């Protein structure tokens, strides 16, 4: 049945961002980083 649906918010990671990998069991930080320029490598 066709019912009204919401307009999903758009999230673009097109600016400096930080992140980290975590291991669920221990909840210990495996790796961490900050991407400022993805073309620098």
């Amino acid at each position: 049945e066709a019912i009204p649906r919401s307009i999903p918010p758009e999230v673009k990671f097109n600016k400096p961002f930080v992140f980290l990998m975590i291991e669920q069991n221990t909840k210990s930080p495996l790796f961490m980083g900050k991407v400022v320029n993805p073309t620098q490598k």
Binding site: P8, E10, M21, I22, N25, S28, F31, M32, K41
Partner: protein, 334 residues
């Protein structure tokens, strides 16, 4: 019951502490390191140290020595390594500790069994006299350890090396919710206020454990890999990066990992391939680890043959994020 959750908040606060320092050096350079790698390495080094050189190390990794008896520390570390090495079935995760001693070298017996037991370290003998040879031997360990991701760890290698402690960690996972290659499309990335780079931008509309945390003034997205690994991305609000970096805490991370509420959003996450080469000697000093890279350093717990010290603290980490998962690798060289 488990021991590691007794040190995890320490590693996590150590991770942010070290992060901040690295961010203060340059503000226009990509950062990427492995908290765990850098920590387990100095953890197993303190075993062979004494006095103020020993205490600085342990206290530098964020351990209030009075509240937690060194014995538990190494013990929780021995456990933490255990668990990390027994990964789920859909997710591979390896780490390894290696010892490179010179041939003549007589070690303090204890030291050896302690690391060989508490840090499941490997033990090797090299002729550092033959630099090139000994150098090449050590790089194959990290090369095989990280499955070819990190290959030129050590470049130069002092003719007089008494011993070398090496560590590595390899990670490869797959997203529960993959990305469709067809969608990956080139989009703009606003590096600077005046700099714009075109980056292949991955896309996918759907349910995401996303959410705007007003405390942080960031968009917090968590992504699960098939297995025991989640990836937390922080998209700071316009002009609040610095505010995000200063407000991170070990317990703020736990919150996000507990919550799971999904929500629909049209996400665009770029696919990257970045790396990090560092000489942590200076940054460690900012955190109180100095006596070791000094002439007062006490590495007596390692050998009585001569007074030692550390000349470097080289770390290298590589990260790959594409439409199917993430494979990062790190290596610590002491």
């Amino acid at each position: 019951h488990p021991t590691f959750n007794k040190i995890t908040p320490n590693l996590a606060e150590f991770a942010f502490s070290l992060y901040r320092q690295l961010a203060h050096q340059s503000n226009s350079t990509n950062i990427f390191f492995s908290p765990v790698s850098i920590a387990t390495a100095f953890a197993m080094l303190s075993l062979g140290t004494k006095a103020d050189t020993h205490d600085e190390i342990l206290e530098g990794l964020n351990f209030n020595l009075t509240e937690i008896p060194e014995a538990q520390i190494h013990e929780g570390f021995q456990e933490l390594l255990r668990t990390l090495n027994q990964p789920d079935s859909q997710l591979q995760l390896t780490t390894g500790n290696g010892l490179f001693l010179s041939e003549g070298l007589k070690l303090v017996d204890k030291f050896l069994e302690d690391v060989k037991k508490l840090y499941h370290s490997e033990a090797f003998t090299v002729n550092f006299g033959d630099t090139e040879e000994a150098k090449k031997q050590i790089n194959d360990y990290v090369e095989k350890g990280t499955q070819g991701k990190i290959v030129d760890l050590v470049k130069e290698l002092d003719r007089d090396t008494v011993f070398a402690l090496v560590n590595y960690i390899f990670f490869k996972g797959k997203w529960e919710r993959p990305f469709e290659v067809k969608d990956t499309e080139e989009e703009d990335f606003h590096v600077d206020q005046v700099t714009t780079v075109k980056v292949p931008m991955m896309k996918r509309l759907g349910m995401f454990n996303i959410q705007h945390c007003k405390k942080l003034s960031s968009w917090v997205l968590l992504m699960k890999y098939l297995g025991n690994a989640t990836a937390i991305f922080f998209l700071p609000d316009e002009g609040k990066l610095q505010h995000l970096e200063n407000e991170l805490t070990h317990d703020i991370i736990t919150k996000f990992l507990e919550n799971e509420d999904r929500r629909s959003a049209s996400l665009h996450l770029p696919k990257l391939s970045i790396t990090g080469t560092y000489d942590l000697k200076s940054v460690l000093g900012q955190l109180g680890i100095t006596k070791v890279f000094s002439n007062g350093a006490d590495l007596s717990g390692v050998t009585e043959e001569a007074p030692l010290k550390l000349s470097k603290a080289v770390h290298k980490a590589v990260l790959t994020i594409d439409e199917k998962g993430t494979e990062a690798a790190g290596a610590m060289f002491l």
